[PDB]
Amino acid sequence: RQQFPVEHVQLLCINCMVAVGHGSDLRKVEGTHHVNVNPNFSNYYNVSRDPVVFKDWKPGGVISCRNCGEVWGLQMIYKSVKLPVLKVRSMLLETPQGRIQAKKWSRVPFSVPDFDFLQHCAENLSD
Ligand SMILES: [Hg+2]
Numbered sequence: 001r002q003q004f005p006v007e008h009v010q011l012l013c014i015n016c017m018v019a020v021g022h023g024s025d026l027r028k029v030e031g032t033h034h035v036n037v038n039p040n041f042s043n044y045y046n047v048s049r050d051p052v053v054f055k056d057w058k059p060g061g062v063i064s065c066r067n068c069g070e071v072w073g074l075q076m077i078y079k080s081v082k083l084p085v086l087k088v089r090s091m092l093l094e095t096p097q098g099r100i101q102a103k104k105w106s107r108v109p110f111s112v113p114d115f116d117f118l119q120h121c122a123e124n125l126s127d
Contacts, residue, residue, distance in 0.1 A: 012091070083115075
């Protein structure tokens with residue numbers, strides 16, 4: 001399989017395929033959970049409190065495309081902070097090669113850095 005710089009892969013909604021994110025905004029939490037840490041991201045998803053029943057994070061609401069209503073994943077919270085956790089199969093990866101839908105995050109044509117909580121406090125004033 002190929003390999004691109006994350007900067008070169010854009011996120012689209014598997015369904016409506018609107019440009020919704022950047023692969024460069026992806027982070028790994030607890031190794032596995034893939035969040036997006038770009039604040040401007042919330043402009044693309046609605047949240048809905050369908051709580052349901054991950055050791056340092058409590059799940060928030062279910063997350064879905066503002067534009068077609070596709071479910072993308074669910075919120076996750078830790079020490080008062082809320083991040084959108086993305087399901088791989090809900091994303092269309094727009095590589096310079098074209099568009100590929102994956103079924104495991106561990107198989108995306110780029111590398112996703114671990115999430116840095118401390119440094120995420122570049123966002124202290126808010127929340
Ligand atoms: Hg959509």
